[PDB]
From Swiss-Prot, chains A, B:
InterPro entries: HAD-like_sf, HAD-SF_hydro_IIB, HAD_sf, PMM, PMM_cap. Involved in the synthesis of the GDP-mannose and dolichol-phosphate-mannose required for a number of critical mannosyl transfer reactions. It catalyses: alpha-D-mannose 1-phosphate = D-mannose 6-phosphate. GO terms for molecular function: metal ion binding; phosphomannomutase activity. Pathway: Nucleotide-sugar biosynthesis; GDP-alpha-D-mannose biosynthesis; alpha-D-mannose 1-phosphate from D-fructose 6-phosphate: step 2/2. Its main location: cytoplasm. This is Phosphomannomutase. It is an enzyme of class 5 (isomerase). Homodimer. Belongs to the eukaryotic PMM family. Pfam families: PMM. One of its GO terms (biological process) is mannose metabolic process. The lineage of its organism: Eukaryota, Fungi, Dikarya, Ascomycota, Saccharomycotina.
């Protein structure tokens, strides 16, 4: 319930990796007691781009009872008070019919272009997106370096993205070219801000967000700068703890 | 590539309705002849706020091969020498996540206010905009006259537009209250100047624009006054004919 909190009208959301935990490690004991004390005053929750099976590694096994809200895959999978609230996936949203046209088009497109180096894992299917690589994610470190230079000279990914946009003008997808070898395809607005529709029915006066990659291009950018949140940029769990202690007057 | 024309560095863009054609009707054969003569000298194109399905009625069946540039819906759909250059829609630009929040808010807002007369078609979804009417576009002629007086006394549309701006401050939308019953909602800058980005790669030294509603509030105002264009205000195709013949030395 939301009955035993000094401010049942304030929610604090946390990016997981690098905000509640170190850069690639598990959560500290002081952070857990800090959250436990924070939960006494306000509603707390987390949001991360990975699934619940990756966040248990970072946050612990008893995660559904540690946070009032648990947002996995940017909120595609959501829990409230430890009960499932909603589940959504890319394939459920787009449907198999459209996804089969999309895959067949991409497979044909890749078979027709001229590449000097091909490897494998040209399409990686994920729960909230697909990733498309003309050379393939199985390229070695050096093959990825080489492809990046080839792609800068011949604009392979850019041209493929434009071909996809014109072939599927009504699919509602966003395309993001990033890194050395690939681009992301996902429904517009399926970033960390996705999770906020899940808390709307509580009509909080304030929604705080803490994240370590709020810069341009980071996966906290959209939700930090969202009008529904008060953003707090951090660089470590230590910053998170320092800010929490003063802001919510923890003892 | 327009290497055949006498001066491929000069583009001439035309508004359609009232500039190339009469008030609301077909294009004359003399205008067609004038354009083809003009086509041999300069790069020509048109820009109109309607979709292809209307301009094919105003300009003719092979409109696609009658102009070097065909800009429908202010250029959201673009053709270059009969080649598809770009395609864009309101829903593709905003995305379903944001559009669903916008619609849900409008439906709830309308359900909460007190109106004497309600009908239907409160939200009209269009390819370049939505139109929102508190009484609804299914209102009869007299019901629209009655609502205009009610709205002028109570400022229903004005209050609703301000509520929309406060709720969605980062949606990048323009609101236009006009007529008796409704207001338009469209992405900022989606006027006839939107098409100018589609010709930016050729770097024309002169882009003429002809328009019959270049006055304040008319749909030609922005592109006529744009610093990239040389504007020519007209009142009928006969004016357009007269100016083209002397300026480009036709006949
Ligand atoms: Cl593959
Ligand atoms: Mg992080
Ligand atoms: Mg913010
Ligand atoms: Mg006109
Ligand atoms: Mg001008």
């Amino acid at each position: 319930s939301f009955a035993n909190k000094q401010d049942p009208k304030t929610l604090v959301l946390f990016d997981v990796d690098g905000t509640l935990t170190p850069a690639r490690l598990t959560i500290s004991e002081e952070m857990k007691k800090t959250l436990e004390k924070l939960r006494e005053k306000v509603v707390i929750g987390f949001v991360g781009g990975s699934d619940l099976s990756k966040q248990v590694e970072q946050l612990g096994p008893n995660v559904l009872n540690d946070f009032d809200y648990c947002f996995s895959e940017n909120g595609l999978t959501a829990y409230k008070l430890g009960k499932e609230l909603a589940s959504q996936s890319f394939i459920n949203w787009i449907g198999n019919e459209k996804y089969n046209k999309l895959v067949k088009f991409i497979l044909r497109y890749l078979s027709d272009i001229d590449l000097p180096i091909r490897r494998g894992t040209f399409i990686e299917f994920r729960n909230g997106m697909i990733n498309v690589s003309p050379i393939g994610r199985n390229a070695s470190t050096q093959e990825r370096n080489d492809y990046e230079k080839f792609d800068k000279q011949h604009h392979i990914r850019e041209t493929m993205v434009e071909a996809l946009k014109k072939e599927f003008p009504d699919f509602g997808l966003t395309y993001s070219i990033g890194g050395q070898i690939s681009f992301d395809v996902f429904p517009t607005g399926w970033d960390k801000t996705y999770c906020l529709q899940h808390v709307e029915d509580e009509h909080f006066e304030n929604i705080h967000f803490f994240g370590d990659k709020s810069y341009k291009g980071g996966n906290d950018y959209e939700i930090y700068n969202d009008p529904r949140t008060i953003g707090h940029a951090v660089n470590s769990p230590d910053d998170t703890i320092r800010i929490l202690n003063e802001t919510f007057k923890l003892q």
